[PDB]
Amino acid sequence: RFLKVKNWETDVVLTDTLHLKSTLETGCTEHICMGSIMLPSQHTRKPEDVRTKDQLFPLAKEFLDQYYSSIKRFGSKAHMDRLEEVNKEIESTSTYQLKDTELIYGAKHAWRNASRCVGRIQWSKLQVFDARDCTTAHGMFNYICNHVKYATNKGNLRSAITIFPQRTDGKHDFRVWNSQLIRYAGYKQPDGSTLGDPANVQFTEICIQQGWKAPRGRFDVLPLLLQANGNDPELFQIPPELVLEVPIRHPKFDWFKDLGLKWYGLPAVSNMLLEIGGLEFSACPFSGWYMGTEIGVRDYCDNSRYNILEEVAKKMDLDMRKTSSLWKDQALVEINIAVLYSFQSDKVTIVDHHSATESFIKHMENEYRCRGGCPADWVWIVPPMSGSITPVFHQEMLNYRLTPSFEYQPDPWNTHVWKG
Amino acid sequence: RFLKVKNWETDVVLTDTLHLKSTLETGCTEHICMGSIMLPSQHTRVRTKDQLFPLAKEFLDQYYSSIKRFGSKAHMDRLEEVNKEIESTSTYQLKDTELIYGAKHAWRNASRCVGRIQWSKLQVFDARDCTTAHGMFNYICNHVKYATNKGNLRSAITIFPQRTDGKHDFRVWNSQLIRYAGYKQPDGSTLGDPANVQFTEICIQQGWKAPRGRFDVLPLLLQANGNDPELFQIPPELVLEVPIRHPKFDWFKDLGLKWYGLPAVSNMLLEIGGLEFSACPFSGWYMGTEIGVRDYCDNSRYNILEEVAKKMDLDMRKTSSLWKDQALVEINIAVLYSFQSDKVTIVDHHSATESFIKHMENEYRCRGGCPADWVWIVPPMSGSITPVFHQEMLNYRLTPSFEYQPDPWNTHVW
Ligand code: HEM
Ligand code: HEM
Ligand SMILES: Cc1cc(N)nc(CCc2cc(F)cc(CC[C@@H]3CCCN3)c2)c1
Ligand SMILES: Cc1cc(N)nc(CCc2cc(F)cc(CC[C@@H]3CCCN3)c2)c1
Ligand SMILES: C[C@H](O)[C@H](O)[C@H]1CNc2nc(N)[nH]c(=O)c2N1
Ligand SMILES: C[C@H](O)[C@H](O)[C@H]1CNc2nc(N)[nH]c(=O)c2N1
Ligand SMILES: [Zn+2]
Prior knowledge:
homodimer; Nitric Oxide Synthase, Chain A, domain 1; Nitric Oxide Synthase,Heme Domain, Chain A, domain 2; 3 domains; 33% helix; globular; binds protoporphyrin IX containing FE; binds 5,6,7,8-tetrahydrobiopterin; binds zinc ion; Nitric oxide synthase 1 (chain A)
């Protein structure tokens, strides 16, 4: 079966056959589309769902078939020997270890398969750091520091992922309790207002309970809370000289610097789960570089985040009485101009949403031609401002789940059995 | 099976049971989501005697429930009467009350429509007695004048006779009652609206005398009883237009932009209780972004971004100056400002999406849900600063419904 997608701006039609290799489920049915559900059950991974031999060798075999195909060795003796070796290791030890080459392939293809990621043109240039020999939270801290230094590269950002030991019985998990490696604290005040990043209040409170001495400012970089081998997590402070930040100023508005805004340069997601051949890597922080709107639209202008639209619109002296003045849209553009101006001026890698979406369309067409498709989630790919003046708005997309993959997992403070 | 949707800005959670009453199909499966396909086969559209009575029964069931007469004598009598009429005539006719209910509920069920908070105030014009294209023209002029109301726009639909054997179809060939012509210039580009180049051709290539201008109101091409379609010019005094100026940039007027007040979709199919109304033009009032973002700034449409930005003297060397985004906001300020100045009804995308969230809350509370298509509900600019961006939505197909149908010129047995 073949499936066509049309770009309604250019009339380019592409044909998807890759969806036939889709294994996991979407959450939709013929009678209901769940395409706007944020974290459906099919995109998450409960740690209690630890796999049996029963289901593991078919997942391994399918991964290894894909791997050996990509290296033009399908059906070779190396291929058959590896299948044999993995089979014996499973029935004997109930799990198996990936080779270094397989791990690198797996992590690159999990990103390649991430249908919500607009930055996938870069997928083949991922630096994979093998941390599967790590045993303690202190060792995790050291690996994460090296990831941050490497990825940051003094502003010339480089994509990277660090992969800690895989899940065994779900009782000895490695977890990074931070949602991102670098994030600002948030503090609920007694008067109900929030200081700092409202999205991080709950995690900030955990850190404080675990002994963090909170500066209680608006942009305090959170400590790392790291869990090795299923033990209680431990606190660590990232060396501040490793945390690259950018003060936000506007190229025309001199008062903008006086808002006191900054952001960090390195977006590094650390709470997702990497699935490769049925193995589950519960700690696998990865990082790239920012698209401007992630900071300028969502981080700064979501009502439930720093929420700076009013103050910016006040200082611009826009007509704030009626929404039809579009004072919110005007301030939004100026804030996003400032984010991009500030990063470029400091020579920190950033991409604007016009550039990123145009590159994604080129990536997607290439993937149709060389791979037979490119799974893509329109709801997430379209940028959160100026949607229809980017080319992805007009692009039909097919969403399906391929493995290897990144999955969501429950926050560990909800599942952890505390040792004390 | 009893599903929940969450708003991530407010944490409000709603429970949906209405989807269990879904009848048509989405195009998705458990292995693939087609949520961003413009026109799956299901959203496009002869009925045999067999499929028609269950459809009629389902519709009459929900109608008599809505008036609290489910299981009443009147209900059962109507069921058998339509049953008798289908067995006999191979179709049936709706009572006026059922027609009005069916139309309002087709709008209520339109999961892609952000304006549905207004669904119950729709003015239904019964045109089922119409027999000719001149009669269709008369009915449409009356609709346009009633709906326009000197700029105090009112929602309305006009329903022409239902499909019979599929050979006597009533169709409005225009996609909207009021749209601007488009012509392929000899110099290579496109004058007017590029979206309407084909239809503009079929007007000339059927008789129209085009002014070959940039904002020429297209004539109506009306098809009655399956005959050949006929041209009619809508009286200009009935077509309310708005010159587009900016409340700060005096040069804006020199761009020469205008738009019409009345958005009136004319090419969809209305399905009520199995019956098919192939000609059912309906109208409401614009959300500003429809004109300013899509009509004016789409690259396949009037595509004015570059010209506006040049007149603003923005740095167009690099995309990262966000000159497109700046111009886009100013264009959309001008649209709202112009309509508001001329006292023509318009809603901005902030007000409309806030209204839709309130509508969703009402529908979940009083109906058990509200089918909604996030890809279409979220506005084409400033998506995440509108509340619908953060609102999870369940998309499913309820009937009565509006459906797409093939363009007539591809189907007409000429
Ligand atoms: C290199 C530049 C990159 C850019 C510009 C980029 C951009 C984005 C953006 C804007 C999103 C939407 C998420 C949101 O709005 O919060 C996203 C999602 C995602 N990105 Fe990328 N990304 C990049 C690199 C990477 C890398 C290196 C990885 C992994 C190796 C990755 C994996 C993902 C995944 C898994 C998601 C999906 C999250 C979900 O399913 O909810 N990205 N990306
Ligand atoms: C009164 C104010 C109204 C507003 C502000 C409004 C707004 C919108 C918008 C912005 C869209 C998106 C489609 C596009 O971008 O081209 C839409 C779709 C739609 N509207 Fe409404 N509308 C209104 C009235 C009505 C009425 C009176 C009807 C029918 C009686 C209706 C039926 C529909 C349908 C069926 C669609 C979806 C077409 C599809 O499935 O692709 N609307 N509306
Ligand atoms: C690697 C990377 C690059 C880049 N430009 N941006 C990112 C962050 C995007 C991202 C990537 C990702 F994989 C997961 C998330 C979490 C999204 C949450 C879910 C609810 C609220 N938001 C976010 C990562
Ligand atoms: C009644 C009405 C009100 C309003 N504010 N806007 C409209 C027009 C919106 C609309 C409503 C509708 F039902 C159909 C269409 C045509 C869809 C095409 C196909 C892809 C691009 N557009 C458009 C109608
Ligand atoms: C409900 C809705 O799915 C949710 O708000 C989504 C919409 N699209 C998104 N797209 C991106 N890139 N990031 C997001 O967090 C979201 N949130
Ligand atoms: C391919 C994609 O579905 C297409 O561009 C859609 C996206 N969302 C839309 N949303 C609305 N309201 N109107 C549209 O025409 C579209 N076009
Ligand atoms: Zn779907």
